[PDB]
Amino acid sequence: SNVLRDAVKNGDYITVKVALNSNEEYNLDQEDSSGMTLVMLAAAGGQDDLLRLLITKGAKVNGRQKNGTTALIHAAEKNFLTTVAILLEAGAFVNVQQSNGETALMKACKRGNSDIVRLVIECGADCNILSKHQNSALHFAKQSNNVLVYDLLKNHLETLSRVAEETIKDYFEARLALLEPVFPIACHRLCEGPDFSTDFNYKPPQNIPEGSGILLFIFHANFLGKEVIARLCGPCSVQAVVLNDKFQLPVFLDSHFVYSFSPVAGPNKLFIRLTEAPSAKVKLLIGAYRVQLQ
């Protein structure tokens, strides 16, 4: 019973091997008053072989504490690179937030570990996410004054925006032209869930070219290493878009990748409902831009 909890907090690989081949029914998802499961304590202590057994014993990788911390966040806190690698190999959600609004990537940027940064953003992490204090991963990376980390993040986002321009060019045959992003393009892992939510701020410029308009794009994208490729056709995972409790409607009835986006100045709330494919390896690049109608 209790024996496995303290065993996992400490080093007892033989004990766990026997308990895992023994004829006793153990709940490997029990949470103490704090809420930590065996998976996240094991990840807290860098005891990797325990993690391999826990994964091969059917243990939720993506649990959460009462303050919203998953095992992956714990691993990121204490620089246990090998543990992060195995969790990402186990289908762990990367972009979950704590009650304070911080993600794993932010911890890795804060402590200056470039390797974790590469590993998570390559597996589809979102850089522009903000905490309750409106600091992004990028601000932490630059204040920690670790050049490799902030170069990595900056080049990653440069690549994302570049591919957005390229794909819209390809799909509208250049009769249309992007002008200025409305709000930092975000990234969503479909395997993480069917819901998507965010809060942003919109500040219009004085000079609005008459005949120009705002559109929301949901590019369906794949990350292969450092290369990202995206599409605005084919299978769509978008069912509904809600901007401030007002549904937004697609510009076309044949596709659900481009929606009309008429935000009001100041704070805005966006929430999208998606299809459920827990095994989908698809990333969604969500961005609302102004555009010119040629």
Residue numbers in the entry: 567 to 860
Give excerpts from the publication.
A 3.04 Å resolution crystal structure of MPP8 CTD (residues 563–860) was determined by molecular replacement using the AlphaFold prediction for the CTD as the search model. The crystal structure reveals a bipartite fold consisting of five ankyrin (helix-loop-helix) repeats followed by a β-sandwich domain. The last α-helix of the ankyrin repeats, helix α 10, is twice as long as the other ankyrin-repeat helices and extends along the β-sandwich domain. The β-sandwich is tightly packed onto the ankyrin repeats and helix α 10. One of the β-sheets (strands β1, β4, β5 and β9) wraps around the C-terminal half of helix α 10. A structural similarity search with DALI34 revealed structural similarity of the MPP8 b-sandwich domain (residues 741–860) to the PINIT domains of the Siz/PIAS RING family of SUMO E3 ligases. The domains have the same topology and overall fold (2.3–2.5 Å RMSD, Z-score 8.4–9.4), although the Siz/PIAS PINIT domains have a flexible N-terminal linker in place of the rigid helical linker (helix α 10) in MPP8. During refinement of the atomic model of MPP8 CTD, we noticed that the eight subunits in the asymmetric unit form four disulfide-linked homodimers. The intermolecular disulfide bond linking the homodimers was formed by cysteine 799, located in the loop between strands β5 and β6 of the PINIT-like domain. We therefore conclude that in the context of the reducing intracellular environment the disulfide bond and dimer interface observed in the crystal are unlikely to be physiologically relevant.
In vertebrates, the Human Silencing Hub (HUSH) is a key repressor of retrotransposons, the subset of TEs that can replicate by retrotransposition. The HUSH complex consists of three proteins: TASOR (Transgene activation suppressor), MPP8 (M-phase phosphoprotein 8), and Periphilin-1 (PPLHN1, isoform 2).11 Periphilin targets HUSH to its genomic loci by binding to nascent transcripts with exons longer than 1.5 kb. TASOR binds both Periphilin and MPP8 to form the HUSH complex. The predicted ankyrin repeats (residues 548–728) and the following C-terminal region (residues 729–860) are both absolutely required for binding to TASOR and for HUSH repression of transgenes and LINE-1s.14,22 In contrast, HUSH repression of an integrated lentivirus reporter is maintained, although slightly delayed, upon deletion of the CD, or indeed the entire N-terminal region of MPP8 (residues 1–499).14 The MPP8 CD binds di- or trimethylated H3K9 peptides with micromolar dissociation constants.
